[PDB]
Amino acid sequence: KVFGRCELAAAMKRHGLDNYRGYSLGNWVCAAKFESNFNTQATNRNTDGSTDYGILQINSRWWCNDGRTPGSRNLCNIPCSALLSSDITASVNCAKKIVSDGNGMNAWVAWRNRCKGTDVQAWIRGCRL
Ligand SMILES: [Cl-]
Ligand code: NA
């Protein structure tokens, strides 16, 4: 599923991400825009052979099981394919665990490079929330 901007904001808000660990909604929508272009089916492969999955591009190296990343961990205890669903619940529950692990949203390279220190509120402007 390819989300609309305000559609995704509302979905995220309903799932408890607004201000989660101090990160306003605009931060999450910005990250999702640049990580996946709002597409739940996005996948990308890394040089070490791990793969990133879904709307927030969560990495099989630490967070999910895809059966082909030898020596990896599965800290959200889910199959990586669950992160590709049109229902974003699994992606969101796993993201909450990632952003809590000490490094906040810096775990998302596109957030660090393209959202951090910008006017992220602009990403939810106009939306009915
Ligand atoms: Cl933080
Ligand atoms: Na894994």
Check which CATH number belongs to the domain holding 115 and give it: 1.10.530.10
Q: Closest by alpha carbon to 83, among 41, 30, 46, 116?
A: 41
Give me the number of domains the chain comprises: 1
CA of 14 to the centre of ligand 2 (A): 28
Q: Which ligand is nearest to the CA of 75?
A: 2
Question: Resolution to 1 decimal, in Å?
Answer: 2.0
- Alpha-carbon gap, residue 107 to 66, rounded angstroms: 20
Name the DSSP class of 120: G
Instruction: Give distance in angstroms: CA of 48 to centre of ligand 1.
Output: 27
Ligand sitting nearest the alpha carbon of 102: 1
Q: Which domain holds residue 92?
A: 1-129
Sign of CA dihedral 98, 106, 6, 83: negative
Q: Which method, experimentally, gave rise to this model?
A: X-ray
101 is in an annotated binding site: yes
What is the C-alpha separation between 83 and 8, in angstroms, rounded?
15
